[PDB]
Amino acid sequence: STGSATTTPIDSLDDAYITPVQIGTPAQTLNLDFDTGSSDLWVFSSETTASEVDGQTIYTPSKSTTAKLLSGATWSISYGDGSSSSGDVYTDTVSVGGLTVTGQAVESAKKVSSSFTEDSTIDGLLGLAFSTLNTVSPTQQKTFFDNAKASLDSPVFTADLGYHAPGTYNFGFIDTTAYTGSITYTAVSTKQGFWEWTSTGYAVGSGTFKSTSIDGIADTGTTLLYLPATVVSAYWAQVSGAKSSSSVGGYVFPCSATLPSFTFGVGSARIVIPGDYIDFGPISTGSSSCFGGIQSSAGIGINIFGDVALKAAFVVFNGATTPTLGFASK
Numbered sequence: 001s002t003g004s005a006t007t008t009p010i011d012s013l014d015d016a017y018i019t020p021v022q023i024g025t026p027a028q029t030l031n032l033d034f035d036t037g038s039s040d041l042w043v044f045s046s047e048t049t050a051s052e053v054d055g056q057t058i059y060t061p062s063k064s065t066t067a068k069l070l071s072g073a074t075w076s077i078s079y080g081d082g083s084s085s086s087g088d089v090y091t092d093t094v095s096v097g098g099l100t101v102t103g104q105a106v107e108s109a110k111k112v113s114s115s116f117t118e119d120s121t122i123d124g125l126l127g128l129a130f131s132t133l134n135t136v137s138p139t140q141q142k143t144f145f146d147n148a149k150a151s152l153d154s155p156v157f158t159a160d161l162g163y164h165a166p167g168t169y170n171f172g173f174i175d176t177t178a179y180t181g182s183i184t185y186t187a188v189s190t191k192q193g194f195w196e197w198t199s200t201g202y203a204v205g206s207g208t209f210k211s212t213s214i215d216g217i218a219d220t221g222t223t224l225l226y227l228p229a230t231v232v233s234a235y236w237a238q239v240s241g242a243k244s245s246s247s248v249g250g251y252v253f254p255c256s257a258t259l260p261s262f263t264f265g266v267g268s269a270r271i272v273i274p275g276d277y278i279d280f281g282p283i284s285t286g287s288s289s290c291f292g293g294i295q296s297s298a299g300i301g302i303n304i305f306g307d308v309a310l311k312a313a314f315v316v317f318n319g320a321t322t323p324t325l326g327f328a329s330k
Contacts, residue, residue, distance in 0.1 A: 034126045
């Protein structure tokens with residue numbers, strides 16, 4: 001089997017991407033944030049505290065003839081941005097772009113933190129990291145991809161995120177029309193539960209490539225590119241007036257600037273992030289200070305190849321017995 005679903009930016013900045021997902025019988029379609037950095041499929045629901053729902057579409061398990069309470073199971077997750085959610089668990093039928101999994105754990109939120117409530121466009125998350133990170137207790141549950149894998153034509157999914165435009169998540173096949181050149185594959189460590197790999201270096205604009213190993217994660221659920229302070233300083237030093245602002249929380253730059261591109265290495269191959277992809281717009285409405293799309297990871301503990309990086313490539317998440325990642329230009 002295969003599936004194919006369009007993923008759409010939630011706003012004019014590409015802050016995140018939503019993909020329609022069918023849950024239950026009859027189908028209830030929710031728009032979920034596919035997140036290769038986490039491993040829980042959770043949704044706003046009829047159980048979510050009413051004051052914490054503000055425009056999201058909810059899953060109502062009592063209206064699904066295929067929903068079953070997973071007795072005793074609870075979940076609770078906290079994300080790198082400080083947001084969080086928690087609740088109980090049902091199993092139900094879940095379909096993405098025509099690919100159906102029966103018995104998928106659907107984690108129903110009883111509580112969500114303010115940032116989730118405040119984002120009316122995201123009805124929940126669909127985790128695509130390794131199932132070892134799933135938070136369901138006392139019996140850990142499998143991701144949608146893990147459950148679908150054996151049925152797929154090939155044990156892979158691909159992320160093709162758009163810049164200010166829709167893109168595609170495919171399951172079970174590699175669309176050879178969706179990228180240019182060849183796909184370069186690179187080793188993955190699953191030891192932390194992430195799609196963790198080592199970039200071979202970087203360049204800023206038309207500058208020379210610096211060969212250096214940068215370990216980080218391919219994370220569709222993180223907006224920006226978080227890299228070591230040395231790399232980020234080298235990037236922003238090429239932008240007149242850019243500075244790191246403690247009050248704003250990262251590098252800012254004059255909105256009048258034209259940003260240089262940023263290149264990262266995948267083996268001997270190179271992915272070029274155009275400068276425009278690094279502009280996240282005014283720090284507050286009407287400001288002429290703009291927020292940078294490349295930021296330091298120094299306070300995180302891990303480098304994160306988020307959407308800024310991934311949307312410059314066609315990315316293969318290869319879930320073969322030994323997982324690997326593939327990157328192509330597009």
